[PDB]
Design an enzyme around this catalytic site. Structure first.
Site, PDB file in Angstrom:
ATOM      1  N   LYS A 143       0.792  -1.220   0.000  1.00 51.63           N
ATOM      2  CA  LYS A 143       0.000   0.000   0.000  1.00 51.63           C
ATOM      3  C   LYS A 143       0.829   1.277   0.000  1.00 51.63           C
ATOM      4  CE  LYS A 143      -2.348  -2.363   3.211  1.00 51.63           C
ATOM      5  NZ  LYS A 143      -1.106  -2.020   3.938  1.00 51.63           N
ATOM      6  N   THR A 144       2.040   1.219   0.552  1.00 52.17           N
ATOM      7  CA  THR A 144       2.894   2.397   0.512  1.00 52.17           C
ATOM      8  C   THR A 144       3.393   2.637  -0.899  1.00 52.17           C
ATOM      9  OG1 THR A 144       4.884   1.138   1.055  1.00 52.17           O
ATOM     10  CG2 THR A 144       3.585   1.992   2.866  1.00 52.17           C
ATOM     11  N   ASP A 154       1.914   6.479   6.089  1.00 54.08           N
ATOM     12  CA  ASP A 154       1.973   5.035   5.932  1.00 54.08           C
ATOM     13  C   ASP A 154       1.960   4.350   7.290  1.00 54.08           C
ATOM     14  OD1 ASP A 154       4.512   5.706   6.721  1.00 54.08           O
ATOM     15  OD2 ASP A 154       5.554   4.638   5.134  1.00 54.08           O
ATOM     16  N   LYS A 167       3.724  -8.996  -1.714  1.00 54.10           N
ATOM     17  CA  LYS A 167       5.006  -8.789  -1.054  1.00 54.10           C
ATOM     18  C   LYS A 167       5.503 -10.106  -0.481  1.00 54.10           C
ATOM     19  CE  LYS A 167       7.612  -7.444   2.702  1.00 54.10           C
ATOM     20  NZ  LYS A 167       7.483  -6.012   3.089  1.00 54.10           N
TER      21      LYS A 167
HETATM   22  N1  ATP Z   1       1.128  -2.213  -8.201  1.00 51.86           N
HETATM   23  C1  ATP Z   1       1.610  -3.159  -7.400  1.00 51.86           C
HETATM   24  N2  ATP Z   1       0.980  -4.334  -7.326  1.00 51.86           N
HETATM   25  C2  ATP Z   1       1.447  -5.290  -6.532  1.00 51.86           C
HETATM   26  N3  ATP Z   1       2.552  -5.150  -5.774  1.00 51.86           N
HETATM   27  C3  ATP Z   1       3.267  -4.012  -5.742  1.00 51.86           C
HETATM   28  C4  ATP Z   1       2.825  -2.921  -6.599  1.00 51.86           C
HETATM   29  N4  ATP Z   1       3.691  -1.916  -6.416  1.00 51.86           N
HETATM   30  C5  ATP Z   1       4.617  -2.341  -5.519  1.00 51.86           C
HETATM   31  N5  ATP Z   1       4.381  -3.610  -5.136  1.00 51.86           N
HETATM   32  C6  ATP Z   1       5.124  -4.449  -4.152  1.00 51.86           C
HETATM   33  O1  ATP Z   1       4.738  -4.100  -2.812  1.00 51.86           O
HETATM   34  C7  ATP Z   1       5.823  -4.285  -1.892  1.00 51.86           C
HETATM   35  C8  ATP Z   1       5.805  -3.259  -0.752  1.00 51.86           C
HETATM   36  O2  ATP Z   1       4.501  -2.820  -0.411  1.00 51.86           O
HETATM   37  P1  ATP Z   1       4.377  -1.822   0.845  1.00 51.86           P
HETATM   38  O3  ATP Z   1       5.732  -1.664   1.488  1.00 51.86           O
HETATM   39  O4  ATP Z   1       3.620  -0.596   0.395  1.00 51.86           O
HETATM   40  O5  ATP Z   1       3.442  -2.615   1.879  1.00 51.86           O
HETATM   41  P2  ATP Z   1       4.061  -3.332   3.167  1.00 51.86           P
HETATM   42  O6  ATP Z   1       4.693  -2.271   4.030  1.00 51.86           O
HETATM   43  O7  ATP Z   1       4.861  -4.527   2.713  1.00 51.86           O
HETATM   44  O8  ATP Z   1       2.732  -3.851   3.898  1.00 51.86           O
HETATM   45  P3  ATP Z   1       2.772  -4.069   5.485  1.00 51.86           P
HETATM   46  O9  ATP Z   1       2.931  -2.668   6.016  1.00 51.86           O
HETATM   47  O10 ATP Z   1       1.452  -4.725   5.797  1.00 51.86           O
HETATM   48  O11 ATP Z   1       3.981  -4.948   5.685  1.00 51.86           O
HETATM   49  C9  ATP Z   1       7.099  -4.215  -2.732  1.00 51.86           C
HETATM   50  O12 ATP Z   1       7.990  -5.261  -2.323  1.00 51.86           O
HETATM   51  C10 ATP Z   1       6.641  -4.322  -4.178  1.00 51.86           C
HETATM   52  O13 ATP Z   1       7.172  -5.444  -4.887  1.00 51.86           O
END
Ligand code: ATP
Ligand code: ATP
Ligand code: ATP
Ligand code: ATP
Ligand code: ADP
Lengths: 17, 526, 492, 243
Positions: free
Chosen positions: C303-304, C357, C462
């Protein structure tokens, strides 16, 4: 309090003619 | 015009590319057809500085560049000596420092002396313009005079200053930028290659001599000596020659007799023994306190777990889609979790490894217990690659069964630092221990940890008896007495508790050892 | 005419305008921006007058009286030229640098330092005493105005104060044009040089700092290790900018966005189009001064990355990302301090989008013995609702992995037009995303395809992206079995 | 004596009976203060659901009275302040108010000021008791100061024994009926009669409960590409609150 406010001063006169 | 024509890269090893940067920043604009330099229209650089941590030979660069360049010998500033009580004199010493230089600028200006100054330990003289460092009297603000002389209205293209610090960030924002201090670069703890080269330089004179450094194997010494650097690295041999010759010098009386023996060799095993005496900046030597008797291989589980360890190591080492990887190894109490998390590091052979544990901090409030962790992980980010251990999560974030009690700031900092990857190009491994996992499930950290391991404890006699053949202290008669009773029992117990109970049970009597061993073993299990 | 400065027409005209006989011209701002070249140009452009090089605290002497003697000797205009030549008009100018050491609030400051160490009274009194000596002009350059501005200003003598130092995101071209003029006239510079292309990385990289790289680009070409001449290439510029010089950059972002954004289905396109619609709602509408949205997903869906994509997709002057990544350990009060700081930065900007976030670990939520940071919660909640002063507009987009708590604490109502991010819907999406990534190939894809439809799958990407790696490391034979074993382990 | 458009940026509407119903009594109570010999002070609530627009209503009441001295006590200026300085500021405001001849002061989002969270009720009792004394603290002099509370939910205040200290109350109901809804929309002039007919059939028959500050937002959110088909979007948005 703000203890240990130890401070030092300098000569600026240097009296001489 | 040009330097003394005898440098030929003498004095230093381990810092080659940074000295190349020094060439192409400082000496380039000097050493070129000057007609084409007029065609360029670029003013020369002044203001090198060196912000390396203690050691690592910054001073030796600051000396050897002066040895190179052909000019009046540089006017050293051995820390602050400009300061004096009578105000105006502290501010005005610098004009005396620059006077001959600006004289050569004005008179005989085109081809010039190219005077240099070293200006060591700026951390004393310069500060944040007097706002910080308590109430620093305006005597402190000599930075203003320095600024105005180096890049003020009157300008100089004939002199360069050097700087040398252990704490650069304490300097004001002003000087570090181009025109005043053009080039900034650390002097880092050198790699194994540079450590070999520097050790080679110190040993080279003796190796050249026929009778010295027999069987020393500097490459072996290099791979052995992990974080030793600079002054520590050469102080090693500065102690080793002494250990080599203490054999000869004492024969404890008035007169000291070594005259007959000048065949001294400086053997290898003296340097190896000597390694024990110096202690490096990082307190990583004392592995033993964590692993006091090591790991004895009993059954397949330890093999499997360490295989997962090397798997995970090479995973982070190879991949870029996981610059970070995070796992605890769960076990019941007294199952060697800390030790078996250290051994994976010993197999991994990473450069920067550190164990954060309450053993390091015993009575620190949650805030300091967080900032220490912050320091550790910042250093790990600062390295290219690393392995961090968090031992006894249960203790770092305090945890008690009576009521739900813990320090939440520790947990938040830890959990954030789990999800926070290092910067681009860097990589990391983080690993943790705990005797409790249902708690971590409750507080939603086991999610953040990427995967898990359930390390077992001793389950049955077909494991226990081999573990007991290991670790000595027993023989076949006691073993036979045991094996029938233990086989039925099928005991479940942990190794640390084992290794304690064995010693206390055995202390009592040569005959009555088993009668106590099994008698207390009745308690734990069933 | 403006030559050697090249930075800005704005101040070069505005300092002169509504000034030109004035006395007390003072120049401040961050260090650099050619405050010395101002003197070096204008003293010459004016009628051939003495520059009067003065070195700031040099006036200080150990003897009594000589300090004041220097500055009264220095002027040499009120004495004679006030009357002489029948002029009644002087040109002499005095320029001082780093005036902070020379001046303090009333003399008792930074140690209550003595009367002859601190006498500003002489110069405070010369102009506002016996007469206003209006035949000369003073230039004061202070790079640290906070120290002296508060207590050294009287209007009419020192009402003049002008902040200086913008990067001039097109005028830096004009700046570096000077120092490249000779390399361009002389056949040194490259053909592949796009000068705007090299300078548009210099958003906060100030023109003052923007000559070290030029010296370095000259010098890397010069570089001979342990002949060919005039090889001033373009190759040096990008390496110089990335490694030797960075300064006052204060810009860190786009590391939460990693591996890119992949459209593994209609939901990603849906949410991104919704965010696009929402940013347009901000931009093209009054009576909607601030917009506030939260996008909930289950963890490890990501989501970030989505929030930062919505940010970077849309050109804005002001974007900033609030995480605990930077402020771990900063207690309940320092956290809200940082938060209101960046929201005041937004309230200063004319149009902005801020992201938060993982509020679930920002405000320190733990499920057992539930506790959190009441104060940062109650500050954040009012910040969601606090409109900026007028006419400017704000976006606030939020991530979290848990919205049940937020609904329970009434944060959800305050949020506007919340949305839902899904996990990986099904194995079809899973395997087409694998083939989109390119970490697997068609044979093992077909092998995976056998066990897809029999079992439905609810997994975050992820976690998937971490999970593939250990199997990839594993040998090609035991790769797919281990992968499927973990996939049936988690998400059944 | 600020202009206070920041608290009323769009404007004030009488969408139906309840607005005149409330502010009639508001000005009534103002005149009652102005002609009160017994009671120097009074204290009202503007209670209602959270998007009713009660804040703006309070501001309109104040500026209709046109007292000499009126001021806000709000978290928007009191943000991040620990409880003892929050109390200090909201106290010195009244200390500045007592000296003027007569006045109204308003306190907005009492709960967000009071740091109230419902997971396990917790807050700063310090500011609470600081406020329960200031409700009833008569000025020393004959001068009259009134108080305007802007609560969001009432049960908790009467759970902390606060309404009995307050003099009186108002219930500010939000948009209840589709015809009044439609009249407010007509006043705001976004959609023509062409669309309003469809709105009339779709939501006029069944009464809906919606807050107005949510309404005027979501119409702007559905405004984009309005001519071809955004009425259905508006309708689906409205459907989930009111049904
Ligand atoms: N459009 C997209 N669709 C799917 N995955 C994505 C997209 N853009 C980025 N990502 C993936 O999302 C991952 C990181 O997401 P993010 O850090 O925003 O959430 P998170 O912090 O892992 O969630 P949480 O806080 O629950 O652990 C990256 O490793 C990346 O590969
Ligand atoms: N090639 C080399 N690389 C690193 N160190 C060296 C090398 N050759 C010699 N040395 C050692 O480095 C030391 C120089 O100390 P250095 O200036 O690096 O310490 P420092 O803490 O930076 O000192 P200070 O900060 O007080 O200036 C010498 O004492 C010398 O023994
Ligand atoms: N895999 C292993 N096999 C045998 N012995 C082990 C193993 N790992 C550790 N040990 C022994 O255990 C000892 C260390 O115990 P350790 O400090 O790990 O216990 P602990 O993890 O602190 O226990 P707890 O987690 O219950 O507090 C070492 O002296 C070591 O010899
Ligand atoms: N009849 C009305 N009277 C007053 N304001 C109205 C009316 N109709 C619409 N409004 C609008 O409502 C907005 C004010 O909302 P308000 O600040 O009362 O919400 P709130 O009570 O702060 O919500 P919360 O209590 O959840 O913080 C104003 O922008 C105003 O234009
Ligand atoms: N257009 C420009 N903008 C900023 N600095 C420049 C420009 N042109 C040249 N300079 C550099 O700026 C320096 C003078 O900067 P100055 O105003 O003294 O900075 P500071 O105020 O930090 O002392 C010179 O040494 C010169 O190399």
């Amino acid at each position: 309090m703000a203890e240990d406010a130890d401070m030092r001063n300098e000569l600026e006169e240097m009296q001489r003619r | 015009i040009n330097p003394d024509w005898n440098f030929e890269k003498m004095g230093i090893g381990g810092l080659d590319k940074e000295f190349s940067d020094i060439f192409r920043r400082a000496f380039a604009s000097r050493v070129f057809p000057p007609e084409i330099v007029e065609q360029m229209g670029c003013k020369h650089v002044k203001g090198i500085l060196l912000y390396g941590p203690p050691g690592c030979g910054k001073t030796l660069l600051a000396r050897q560049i002066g040895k190179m360049l052909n000019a009046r010998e540089p006017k050293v500033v051995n820390g602050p000596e400009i300061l004096n009580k009578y105000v105006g004199e502290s501010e005005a010493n610098i004009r005396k420092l620059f006077a001959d230089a600006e004289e050569e600028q004005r008179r005989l200006g085109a081809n010039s002396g190219l005077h240099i100054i070293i200006f060591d330990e700026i951390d004393a003289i310069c500060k944040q313009r007097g706002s910080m460092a308590g109430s620093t009297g305006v005597h402190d603000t000599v930075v203003n005079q320095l600024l105005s002389k180096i890049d003020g209205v009157e300008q100089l293209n004939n002199i360069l200053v050097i700087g040398m610090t252990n704490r650069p960030d304490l300097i004001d924002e002003a000087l570090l930028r181009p025109g005043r201090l053009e080039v900034k670069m650390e002097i880092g703890l050198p790699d194994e290659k540079g450590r070999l080269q520097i050790l080679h330089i110190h040993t080279a004179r003796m190796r050249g001599h026929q009778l010295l450094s027999a069987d020393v194997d500097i490459k072996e010494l290099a791979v052995e000596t992990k974080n030793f650097s600079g002054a520590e690295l050469e102080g090693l041999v500065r102690a080793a020659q002494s250990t080599a010759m203490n054999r000869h010098i004492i024969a404890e009386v008035d007169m000291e007799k070594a005259e007959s023996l000048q065949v001294t060799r400086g053997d290898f095993l003296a340097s190896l023994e000597n390694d024990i005496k110096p202690a490096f900046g990082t307190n990583q030597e004392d592995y033993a306190s964590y692993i006091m008797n090591g790991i004895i291989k009993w059954g397949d589980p330890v093999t499997r777990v360490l295989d997962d360890g090397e798997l995970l190591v090479q995973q982070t080492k190879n991949s870029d889609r996981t610059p970070l990887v995070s796992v605890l190894l769960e076990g019941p109490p007294h199952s060697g979790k800390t030790a078996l998390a250290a051994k994976i590091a010993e197999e991994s052979n990473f450069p920067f490894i550190k164990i954060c544990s309450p053993d390091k901090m015993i009575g620190f409030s949650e805030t300091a217990k967080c900032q220490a962790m912050k320091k550790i992980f910042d250093d790990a980010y600062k390295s290219q690659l690393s392995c961090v251990v968090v031992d006894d999560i249960e203790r770092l974030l305090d945890y008690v069964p009576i009521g739900p009690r813990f320090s939440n700031l520790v947990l938040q900092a830890l959990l954030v630092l789990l999800k926070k990857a290092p910067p681009q190009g860097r990589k990391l491994l983080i690993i943790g221990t705990t005797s409790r996992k249902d708690v971590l499930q409750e507080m939603e950290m086991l999610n953040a940890f990427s995967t898990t391991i359930h390390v077992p404890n001793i389950a049955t006699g077909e494991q226990l008896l081999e573990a007991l053949e290991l670790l000595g202290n027993f023989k076949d008669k006691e073993r036979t007495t045991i094996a029938q009773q233990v086989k039925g029992k099928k005991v479940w117990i942990g190794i640390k508790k084992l290794l304690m109970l064995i010693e206390m049970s055995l202390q009592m009597d040569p005959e009555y050892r088993v009668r106590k061993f099994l008698a207390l073993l009745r308690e734990e299990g069933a």
